[PDB]
Amino acid sequence: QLKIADIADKYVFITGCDTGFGNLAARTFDKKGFRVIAACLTESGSAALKAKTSERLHTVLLDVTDPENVKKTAQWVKSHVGEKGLWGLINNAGVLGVLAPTDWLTVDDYREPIEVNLFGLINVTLNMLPLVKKARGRVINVSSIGGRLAFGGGGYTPSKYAVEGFNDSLRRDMKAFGVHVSCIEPGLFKTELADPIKTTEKKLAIWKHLSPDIKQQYGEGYIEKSLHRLKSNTSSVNLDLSLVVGCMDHALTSLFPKTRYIAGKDAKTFWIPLSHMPAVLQDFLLLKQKVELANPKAV
Amino acid sequence: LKIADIADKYVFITGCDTGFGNLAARTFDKKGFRVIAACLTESGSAALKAKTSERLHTVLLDVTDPENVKKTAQWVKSHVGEKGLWGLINNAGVLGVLAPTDWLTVDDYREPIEVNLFGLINVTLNMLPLVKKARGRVINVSSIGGRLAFGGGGYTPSKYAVEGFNDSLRRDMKAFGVHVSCIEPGLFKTELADPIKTTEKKLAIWKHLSPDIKQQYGEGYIEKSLHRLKSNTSSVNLDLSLVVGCMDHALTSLFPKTRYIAGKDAKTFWIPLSHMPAVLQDFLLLKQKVELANPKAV
Ligand SMILES: NC(=O)C1=CN([C@@H]2O[C@H](COP(=O)(O)OP(=O)(O)OC[C@H]3O[C@@H](n4cnc5c(N)ncnc54)[C@H](O)[C@@H]3O)[C@@H](O)[C@H]2O)C=CC1
Ligand SMILES: NC(=O)C1=CN([C@@H]2O[C@H](COP(=O)(O)OP(=O)(O)OC[C@H]3O[C@@H](n4cnc5c(N)ncnc54)[C@H](O)[C@@H]3O)[C@@H](O)[C@H]2O)C=CC1
């Protein structure tokens, strides 16, 4: 294979490096000899990341939903990289948000995941884009199988579908500047994103204030019956985060970066294939394992 | 065959002032449905009332106003009583600012996402108990723009998002016998997409654009891009009834489809192109795009 040269002279900006993919990426690209700028949400996230990495790495406190903070951070990066520009932007920061049946939710429940996963990713992209153009560099967007195949109710799937759409508008707009745009679609991975207990604890808070009608339709025990089911399929979840960082690595360092990478044997052989199937067949296969409502005719 | 007792069934349609929503309100009124036509403007609803039977009611709805949506859902709940709401057609939408991504701020993305996604979701969540009651139909108007990305701006993200929400809703509602249909129109002559309106927004943005971007694209880029939009306004459907016919099948068929494609453009070019890898989409979609004056001026 043909890799790029002068990795040591190139800067990579990564969002959400406190935990998960972003943290392993910051550490992996620091070892590789890139100059990493690791955006962290929390002081302890950045202190633990600094403590584990070389002097080539800098950390910045970034909340991607704070437009002043994003603009300041882009100003800082612009001074520091000067005429090298910014070789690599990895939009990794994301949250699950509330995940529940659609008919349990209000529109406000949809706001948080869209604000981080879409608006935050867009604003960071628009603020760094002049620097990535300058370097003729790489924008890497972290999507989800949830951006090709809808999860249950909540803003996560809409936010990820939207990222897929923005990613393609950006790729086509940037082809003229020699800037490559790569979309990464991970399967299910053990990170801090998706915590069966955290997810069940949010469903229970919603249940507490849910109308009598919905409670009668689903039935008492629905939440706990559907946790016994989530836990039946927690074995088939990747613990190897490097399958995703390897994809970021190829998108950063390959002379021929792919427009889409799929991480996880789950994703390559089940989820993405299922995303190409007509809805009749997706609904058939996805609904086979769903908890029966107590009183569906109580409408 | 078709359902029975069309005359006993209510259909709520958003954005009936103009375009698909207007033709749908009129077509379903003629068909003998009891239409509740949500209009953005007083003059939109006065002209719609004036052209339709006494079976039709109009309500003033801004889908981005959550108080207005909740009030309208209360009004509908009283009026349909125990029939519930047989049909919800989420039709209301706007294009927003359409321009190269590197011209835009995040704020430019907000309006189309607020109408096309948040507005559609909030109207859906407020009417859903009534649609469950009727064991009825939710019909979401997407776009080829929700399967294949248009230029920069929030329209394509909003439409991709609708496609995602549509599938979450279909799967959540299968247990209540509620069917969910997604309509993907090609390009149609409505008030949505107006080459002159689109060019007039690009020019206002140009006026405040950084020296760097202006050098890269070059003076005349916008006007060269209008000469090109106007070269391909022949290949734009004038027959809005191709879309309302799809809504009709989704409302009245015992076997409503999960997705309808309207336009010969959409069936034979756009949707096929949406299944191709990016190398091939970018090849075909970029062939006809205005060369930048100084792309290396970065
Ligand atoms: N782990 C999985 O199974 C899947 C993960 N993904 C995506 O991978 C990306 C990374 O998440 P994971 O590493 O899995 O989880 P994680 O929660 O461990 O990492 C997400 C990161 O986002 C940061 N973050 C959250 N809100 C932020 C904000 N407002 N501003 C700045 N940073 C913020 C957190 O500090 C954290 O470092 C996300 O975009 C997620 O949607 C994709 C598909 C599924
Ligand atoms: N016309 C086309 O070629 C295409 C249209 N579509 C979709 O068709 C749908 C209907 O639009 P068209 O009839 O084509 O355009 P249009 O502009 O003629 O109709 C849109 C309707 O939405 C209403 N509306 C706009 N903002 C609103 C708000 N905040 N609250 C309530 N109502 C509001 C307007 O009053 C109007 O009646 C849209 O969702 C659009 O995205 C799909 C693909 C392309």
Numbering used by the authors:
A (entry chain A): 21 to 319
B (entry chain B): 22 to 319
List sentences from the manuscript.
To crystallize DHRS9, we created a water-soluble form of the mouse enzyme by removing the N-terminal amino acids forming the transmembrane segment. As described under Experimental Procedures, the highly purified water-soluble form of DHRS9 was crystallized in complex with NADH. Consequently, the final model of DHRS9/NADH complex consists of protein residues 21 to 319 (chain A), 22 to 319 (chain B), two NADH molecules and 32 water molecules. The cofactor molecule was bound in the extended conformation with the nicotinamide moiety in syn conformation and the adenine ring in the anti conformation. The nicotinamide of NADH was stabilized through the hydrogen bonding interactions with Phe209 and Thr211. In DHRS9, the catalytic tetrad was represented by residues Asn137, Ser164, Tyr176, and Lys180 (for more details). Dimerization was mediated by the interactions between two long helical motifs (helices α4 and α5) coming from each monomer. In general, this oxylipin-binding cavity appeared to be rather large (a solvent accessible volume of 974 Å3 and surface area of 1293 Å2; these values also include the cofactor binding site).
pmcDHRS9 is member four of the 9C family of the short-chain dehydrogenase/reductase (SDR9C4) superfamily of proteins. DHRS9 is an integral membrane protein of the endoplasmic reticulum. However, recently, we have demonstrated that DHRS9 is a highly active oxylipin dehydrogenase. It utilizes oxylipin substrates generated through 12-lipoxygenase, 15-lipoxygenase, and cytochrome P450 oxygenase pathways, and its activity towards oxylipins far exceeds its activity toward retinol or sterols.
